[PDB]
């Protein structure tokens, strides 16, 4: 029946959202243990610091620009799915506010968490980068450097993880509420 089918919609929609939020994880891990693998190959030929921030300045922005280009996707295709399923209940009323009102909440609510994860990180870069200036203003060695280095890497991971279990989180909720809706445009 068509409660089913849109319960499948939603589900595929959530299922979605995942597999692209942990492609954006694992990539995010990837650059950053590049860029920690480039400090480490310039503190291996003893390289000073001026040439060693340039660098890590440079491979942050390119991870958050990465960060901004996953998350728009994200919301590209989450919009597009929400459209699809509206268009489907469009057979169980006509101009179906409630459930139009929500998807739109759903949207939004996924909206606010990837933008937070873009804050985030660009701020969380700016606060890396100043720890890796200060550390070799005061003379810290390799081992000290790389180890924090990837202390703050993994936090930077750890809460863009922690957004996107919100997000899924948040959305699965959302998903009951809408479903319930929809079967109440139904007849009994």
């Given at each position: 029946g068509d409660n089913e089918e849109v319960k499948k919609m939603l589900e595929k929609?959530?299922?979605?959202?995942?597999?692209?939020?942990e492609k954006?994880?694992?990539?995010?891990?990837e650059m950053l243990e590049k860029m920690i693998k480039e400090i480490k190959k310039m503190l291996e030929?003893?390289?000073?610091?001026?040439?060693?921030?340039?660098?890590?300045?440079?491979?942050?922005e390119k991870i958050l620009k990465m960060v901004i280009e996953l998350a728009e996707k994200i919301l590209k295709k989450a919009k597009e799915m929400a459209e699809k399923i509206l268009?489907?209940?469009?057979?169980?009323g006509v101009d179906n506010e409630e459930v139009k009102k929500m998807l739109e909440k759903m949207i939004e609510e996924?909206?606010?968490m990837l933008e937070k994860a873009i804050k985030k990180v660009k701020e969380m870069l700016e606060k890396?980068?100043?720890?890796?200036?200060?550390?070799?203003?005061?003379?810290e060695d390799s081992e000290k450097i790389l180890k924090?280095?990837?202390?703050?890497?993994?936090?930077?991971?750890?809460?863009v993880i922690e957004l996107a279990e919100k997000i899924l989180k948040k959305?699965?909720?959302?998903?009951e509420k809408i479903l319930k809706k929809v079967k109440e445009l139904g007849v009994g």
């Open positions: 929609m959530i299922e979605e959202i995942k597999k692209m939020l954006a994880i694992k990539k995010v891990k030929n003893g390289e000073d610091s001026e040439k060693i921030l340039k660098k890590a300045k440079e491979m942050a268009k489907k209940v469009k057979e169980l996924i909206k606010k890396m980068i100043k720890e890796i200036k200060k550390m070799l203003e005061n003379g924090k280095a990837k202390e703050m890497a993994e936090k930077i991971l750890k809460m959305a699965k909720e959302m998903a």
